[PDB]
Amino acid sequence: SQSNRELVVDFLSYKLSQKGYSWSQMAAVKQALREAGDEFELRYRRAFSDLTSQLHITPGTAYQSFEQVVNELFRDGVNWGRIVAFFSFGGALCVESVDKEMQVLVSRIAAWMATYLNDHLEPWIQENGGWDTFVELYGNNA
Amino acid sequence: MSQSNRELVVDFLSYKLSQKGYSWSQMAAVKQALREAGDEFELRYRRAFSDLTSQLHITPGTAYQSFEQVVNELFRDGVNWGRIVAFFSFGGALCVESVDKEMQVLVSRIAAWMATYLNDHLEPWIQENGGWDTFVELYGNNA
Amino acid sequence: SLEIEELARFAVDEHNKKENALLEFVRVVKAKEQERNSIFEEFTMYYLTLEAKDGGKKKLYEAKVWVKRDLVFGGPENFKELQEFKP
Amino acid sequence: SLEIEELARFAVDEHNKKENALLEFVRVVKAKEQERNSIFEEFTMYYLTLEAKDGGKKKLYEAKVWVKRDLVFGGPENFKELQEFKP
């Protein structure tokens, strides 16, 4: 019923997205960031391999180790491209974790990513017009 | 802090996992299977589906009864997973047609109509046929 | 193996109807099936080698028969179709 | 202006390297620039008209030079490439 509403909204959001429309501004941001991640992983296959190889997450990995490697993306400053790289980095660490039957780490990586956004990126995002601006600069919307 | 940033993290991780055949959650697996089924339906039944969509053009005047009457055709011979997918695809087509006519306000009404139709006419069959988890095992592309 | 014989009979009977021919079904020599059953459609393709008499003379024929049901817009009815029939 | 001069000088050098030629840069006569960019990459595209000496005689040449920047991993040190060079 509430699950049935959630399926209807997800499906309609997808069908609108396929034509360049969006359910909501949040749906448009989710779609733009999904697409941007795929483009990033295509364009930066080799350089991205170099970044993921620097952190093999185990149950004993501390946030501080993730924070130090992520900081490398942002040493020259924050921009939307580097924020996309940061999301792709998190996604690759999750996939790697599941591949190794260390599913326990997916929830932890999500928490780390939210910590890193709060601490390092959100001030820049809010003074640069928010995710609404990202969709304006990257989204393929009608 | 930011609940929007948390939602974008979860959405992006759900997507990346799904691309490798993994699922954030059982709900994420149901959503992905229905997205894929809707795509397959629209490719296979392009011609017959166009005969269904042509029967209803929604305007501010259109009552739920007119929507119900057309969707009722779909399920005349009974409910099955393929017809449920068609139902979702029909609603998707009505939402795209609405936005094409600069009437996005109708999208929320169509979503409400679809949720009403599901709970009223389809949920009893879904529950006695093993629910959406049955749909995923059968149809899902999962690792 | 019994329901294969009915499809082979159908292939001969369908070939005779369509080509104004009088081939006489003797038996199924061999049969292969490939299937695609989804939430949308039931599809079986049968490759039958059969023996039939053409003016009393037994000869070998291969027939391709398709059986389909559309689970979305179709009836309870299946649909048999002869695709190919050659010696 | 000095950045335009560098790109004109690069265009002549790259032409001479590619075509075993000896054109001598004199000056830039006009420069147009367009920008193409995504969140990952910046292109600044220069349409240069330049004067160069061919065997000591001044002639006009059109060059197209691209300056590319990787916005994710790149440094300040950009990448020049010569796309076209014609009299």
Author numbering:
A (entry chain B): 2 to 143
B (entry chain A): 1 to 143
C (entry chain D), D (entry chain C): 4 to 90
Give me lines lifted from the publication on this model.
BCL‐xL‐AF10 showed problems during purification so was not further characterised. Both BCL‐xL‐AF6 (IC50=448±53 nM) and BCL‐xL‐AF7 (IC50=393 ±54 nM) were shown to act as sub μM inhibitors of the BCL‐xL/BAK interaction but were ineffective in inhibiting the MCL‐1/NOXA−B interaction. In the case of BCL‐xL‐AF6 a particularly strong enthalpic contribution was observed. For BCL‐xL‐AF6/BCL‐xL, the crystals diffracted to 1.91 Å, and the asymmetric unit contains one domain swapped dimer of BCL‐xL, with one BCL‐xL‐AF6 bound to the cleft of each monomer. The residues within the VRs of both Affimers interact with residues lining the BH3‐binding cleft on the surface of BCL‐xL. However, the universally conserved BH3 Asp which hydrogen‐bonds to Arg on BCL2‐ family members is not replicated in any way by the Affimer. On inspection it is apparent that the Affimers select a distinct conformation of the BCL‐xL domain. The binding groove on BCL‐xL is formed by helices 3 and 4 and helix 3 is mobile such that the width of the groove can vary. When BH3 peptide is bound, helix 3 moves to accommodate the peptide in a relatively wide groove (groove open conformation). When bound to BAK peptide the groove is 14.8 Å wide at the widest point, whereas in the small molecule and Affimer bound conformation it is ∼11.0 Å wide. In this case, not only does the Affimer bound conformation correspond to a small molecule bound conformation (thus this might conceptually be a better starting point for structure based drug design), but the groove closed conformation is also a conformation where the groove is too narrow to accommodate the BH3 helix, possibly potentiating the orthosteric competitive effect.
